[PDB]
Design brief:
cytoskeleton, alpha+beta, globular, 2 domains, five-stranded antiparallel beta sheet, ubl conjugation, three-stranded antiparallel beta sheet, Transferase(Phosphotransferase), domain 1, binds ligand UMN, apoptosis, Phosphorylase Kinase, domain 1, cell junction
Amino acid sequence: PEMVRGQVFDVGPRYTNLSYIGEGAYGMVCSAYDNVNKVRVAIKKISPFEHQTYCQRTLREIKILLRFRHENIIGINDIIRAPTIEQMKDVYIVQDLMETDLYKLLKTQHLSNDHICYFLYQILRGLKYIHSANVLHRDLKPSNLLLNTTCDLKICDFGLARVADPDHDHTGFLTEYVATRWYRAPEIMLNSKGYTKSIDIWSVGCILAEMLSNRPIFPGKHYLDQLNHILGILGSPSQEDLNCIINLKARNYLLSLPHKNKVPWNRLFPNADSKALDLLDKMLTFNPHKRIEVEQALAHPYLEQYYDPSDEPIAEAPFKFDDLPKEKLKELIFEETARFQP
Ligand SMILES: O=C(CN1Cc2ccc(-c3nc(NC4CCOCC4)ncc3Cl)cc2C1=O)N[C@@]1(CO)CCc2ccccc21
């Protein structure tokens, strides 16, 4: 078997000529020549079976992405594993290989308004489909938006994704949360478990602001610092928005802060298109009930050149399927990956 940077890659025979790409908690990723389709692909080796939280991320990633089929959502092309549960130590997930991601692009490149518009359109078109299946991505951020050489965009990493559950959304003040800090809606720190579609729209709002200036809009260094960066720009919540926060610890925290005025978007973003800033404002609304929805966002005048609801598909049916053990999640992973065996 091939090795890459001191790791076995048991992807053959089909997948050969393996170049390293990168690495994280998830595992390792390489490009590989796919000998059946005659194209290089991404393959990420997951070795999750000794941690039930990595097994959860693996099952979510595989189950959701095999159900979903959409031009702006990364697919799974193939999955490699051993022929039995016992011999299965790794899972290789094969996906279309993409040139870069929006994180890398923003650290190096100025985006034209035309590029910003097209990226935003694609994010929302993928998100329309995600949300139509009653799913929340819950970790939208520039590194989870893959880009090819002609700026086609695909949303990736569904390991935190959930079915939406807005009747179980309420929680207490300062409840801990897993998704990336800078893209967390203000309600996460106040009274929300992050089980509504409006969580994803906030993150998209954050991404949009970041495309306008190549800097994160709300770069909090710790849990509550994130709300204070948010309130620094949006200003103090209105009476009406506060009355919606019935939790007293959260309410009284907000009432304790000195009055802060709204920083106008056109002063933060002097070179931005005014329609982009109108849509930004609606995505970065403090009150999640007042926040724009994905379909309204698509219909916003900023995206008029692209908007076409007939060419913005939805899922044919809602998605469905939990503190289960590592060993049962392994079984589920084995069942879900069977279609790729000879
Ligand atoms: O799966 C991920 C996250 N990952 C990691 C990852 C690397 C690579 C690419 C990729 N990259 C390029 N191209 C790159 C060229 C260089 O520039 C950047 C772009 N093309 C195509 C692809 Cl699918 C995509 C991903 C991705 O979704 N986590 C998961 C799910 O939460 C799995 C299972 C698991 C277990 C524990 C914890 C996390 C996770």
